[PDB]
Amino acid sequence: EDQDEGPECNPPIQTVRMKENAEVGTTSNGYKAYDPETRSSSGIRYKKLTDPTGWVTIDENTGSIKVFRSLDREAETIKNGIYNITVLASDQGGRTCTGTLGIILQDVNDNSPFIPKKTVIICKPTMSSAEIVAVDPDEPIHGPPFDFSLESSTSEVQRMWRLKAINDTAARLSYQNDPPFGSYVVPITVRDRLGMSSVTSLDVTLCDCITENDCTH
């Protein structure tokens, strides 16, 4: 009669693939410890060891991966779309085996655009405008074209400015109604190609210049 002997946990290293928009608690196919006698490892329970992100948890019964807190592909903890977590199996004979679970992460468009440069000069004696350019940190299929506007701003601020588009990534902000030399705030709204939305408040000095770039000192 059969008795429950030791696990042959090969391969060392395993992989799964996941997608960024994954709901909290969702479960999918997972890491295994192996048990050749029974050709199945049905007593054998699972925990996680070290994790860079804290996004997933491992379903103890089955060794399945499940979401715990929501993902990002735009984070610095990914490289070439991949991260890894370390895994342990626990046996009621007083035994263990160990391994790695890699997690390949498909981007979806979820991040909005941001502004690299929010501080801008308008040299009034030769210029009416300054350019406003953005970036979006999803894939290049998942960002531009951007749709800019003065949407979020006030009816007083809208009476001093006009905004117009100039590229897939850019627009140009212009003064109206002879405003005086000085410094000013402008809220922009920007959406990306699927309508992901960002708010951002610009710094706009309108001044007198030599270089036509920065203000006379």
From Swiss-Prot:
Induction: Induced in the hours following cyclic mechanical strain in keratinocytes.
Glycosylation-annotated residues: N84, N167
Location of the protein in the cell: Cell membrane; Cell junction, Desmosome
Domain named Cadherin: residues: 10-117, 118-217
Tissue expression profile of the protein: Expressed at intercalated disks in the heart, where it is colocalized with CDH2 (at protein level). Expressed in intestinal mucosal cells (at protein level).
Organism superkingdom: Eukaryota
Function summary: A component of desmosome cell-cell junctions which are required for positive regulation of cellular adhesion. Promotes timely incorporation of DSG2 into desmosome intercellular junctions and promotes interaction of desmosome cell junctions with intermediate filament cytokeratin, via modulation of DSP phosphorylation. Plays an important role in desmosome-mediated maintenance of intestinal epithelial cell intercellular adhesion strength and barrier function.
Miscellaneous field: Expression is decreased in the intestinal mucosa of ulcerative colitis patients, potential adversely effecting wound healing of the intestinal mucosa.
Quaternary organization: Interacts with DSP, PKP2 and JUP. Interacts with DSG3; the interaction may limit the interaction of DSC3 with p38MAPK family members and therefore repress p38MAPK signaling activation.
Domain notes: Calcium may be bound by the cadherin-like repeats. Three calcium ions are usually bound at the interface of each cadherin domain and rigidify the connections, imparting a strong curvature to the full-length ectodomain.
Annotated disorder: Arrhythmogenic right ventricular dysplasia, familial, 11: A congenital heart disease characterized by infiltration of adipose and fibrous tissue into the right ventricle and loss of myocardial cells, resulting in ventricular and supraventricular arrhythmias.
Protein name in the entry: Desmocollin-2
Organism phylogeny: Eukaryota, Metazoa, Chordata, Craniata, Vertebrata
Gene: DSC2
Residues of the full protein shown: 463 to 679 of 901
